[PDB]
């Protein structure tokens, strides 16, 4: 089957440059180009551009023309992408696909000037004050990288969860999730937040006491 | 730039309906060599676009057949006769005619359900947090449906946005509803030469503000 071999994820400096590959087999190589499309997290699709491997044509999309390099080796079967002058706009995740059937699995990539920074967790209780369903909650800020693995009792008080997608802070992560239950199980009971860091080989917990 | 716009840019739909998406280029995409080079792609969180539709109404290998494609010159229109589960994603049409090639904004196929208001909770610091200097103001907008919505913060009565951070969750894998966190972050300081937080979530389900609300010093 035709196969296409990204190299893994890339998190790099800003200013820097990164070179990622894709490893064709399954096919000839030589036989069609080899296009790279780009897309920013959350968002669209865009297509860089293509390199011919048989006599190592190119040919970009004016957007891409000196922030993206395309290159080929014959006796490898793999084409190569250099992106040159990173930003943080250049963070996305990167295919290469022969045609429009078989694409690559992407390289992810990062460009952050951070250094692992373990997360803070803070507990959400409610506002002093009660209705029969309860809402708490768990912030955990300033991370890096990504990502962290939160739960709630361990695991075990999984529905009625709402764990969000985390965004950039300065150059820091921040998340949060909320989770409720009827009045009758809190605080009568205990709930605790489970944060796993495995960037930090931090795992934390917090529980919501009443204000 | 031939470019391409899709529509619309959201479907909700329930099991078993029929499913129509619209992409039109704002230019006539026959290539060169006689062929006609639109695409369509089918991409789920987290995985690459997988292609369905190649040169107008070509089904690629293993795709099913309520899947089909038409249209020509500058209109074309995806088709899925009875939507299953594993068709919820992001469709995208793409033009490889003409350079630079370009794909259509995309459109997210989800599911259809009963409107319902969201369950609003706001959350003033932890005591934790304030002692490390930082002040954290959380305000969750949970289940509610449609997806669009929007949420506003005031400071003793003062529009704010300097310092709010938004996050909004995939559609429920459960009862099909969407949820937002907002989160504004000032220091101690700042947080403590004011009194009343407010954050109002105005949703389609009311032409009324839904405010939640607290006063610092009690
Ligand atoms: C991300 C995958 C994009 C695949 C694009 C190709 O698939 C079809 O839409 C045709 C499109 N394509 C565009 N250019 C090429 C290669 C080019 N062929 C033609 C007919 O211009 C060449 O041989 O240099 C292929």
């Known amino acids: 089957k035709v196969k296409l071999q990204e190299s893994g994820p890339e998190l790099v400096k800003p200013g820097a440059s990164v070179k990622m590959s894709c490893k064709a087999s399954?096919?000839?190589?030589?036989?069609?180009?080899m296009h790279w499309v780009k897309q920013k997290p959350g968002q669209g699709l865009e297509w860089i551009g293509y390199?011919?491997?048989?006599?190592?044509?190119?040919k970009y999309n004016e957007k891409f023309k000196g922030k993206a390099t395309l290159t080929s080796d014959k006796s490898s079967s793999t084409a190569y992408m250099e992106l040159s002058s990173l930003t943080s706009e250049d963070s996305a995740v990167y295919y290469c696909?022969?045609?429009?059937?078989?694409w690559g699995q992407g390289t992810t990539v990062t460009v952050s000037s951070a250094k692992t920074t373990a997360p803070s967790v803070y507990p959400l209780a409610p506002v002093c004050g009660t209705g029969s369903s309860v809402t708490l909650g768990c912030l955990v800020k300033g991370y890096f990288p990504e990502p962290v693995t939160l739960t709630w009792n361990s695991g075990s008080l999984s529905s009625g969860v709402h764990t969000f997608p985390a965004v950039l802070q300065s150059d820091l992560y921040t998340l949060s999730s909320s989770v409720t239950v009827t009045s009758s199980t809190w605080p009568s009971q205990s709930i605790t937040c489970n944060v796993a860091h495995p960037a930090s080989s931090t795992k934390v917990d917090k529980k919501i006491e009443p204000r | 730039d031939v470019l391409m716009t899709q529509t619309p840019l959201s479907l909700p739909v329930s099991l078993g309906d029929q499913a129509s998406i619209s992409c039109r280029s704002s230019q006539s995409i026959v290539h060169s060599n006689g062929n006609t080079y639109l695409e369509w792609y089918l991409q789920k969180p987290g995985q690459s676009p997988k292609l369905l539709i190649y040169?107008?109404?070509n089904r690629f290998s293993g795709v099913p057949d309520r899947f089909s494609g038409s249209g020509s010159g500058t209109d074309f229109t995806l088709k899925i006769s009875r939507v299953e589960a594993e068709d919820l994603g992001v469709y995208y049409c793409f033009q490889g005619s003409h350079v630079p090639l370009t794909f259509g904004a995309g459109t997210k196929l989800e599911l259809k359900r009963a409107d319902a208001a969201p369950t609003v909770s706001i959350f003033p610091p932890s005591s934790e947090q304030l002692t490390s200097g930082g002040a954290s103001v959380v305000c969750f907008l949970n289940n509610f449906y449609p997806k669009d919505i929007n949420v506003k913060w005031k400071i003793d009565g003062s529009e704010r946005q300097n310092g709010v951070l938004n996050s909004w969750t995939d559609q429920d894998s459960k009862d099909s509803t969407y949820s937002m966190s907002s989160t504004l972050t000032l220091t101690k300081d700042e947080y403590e030469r004011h009194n009343s937080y407010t954050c109002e979530a105005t949703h389609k389900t009311s032409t009324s503000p839904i405010v939640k609300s607290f006063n610092r010093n009690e």
């Open positions: 696909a022969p045609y429009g059937g078989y």
């Open positions: 040169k107008v109404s």
């Open positions: 399954g096919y000839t190589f030589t036989s069609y180009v």
């Open positions: 390199i011919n491997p048989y006599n190592d044509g190119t």
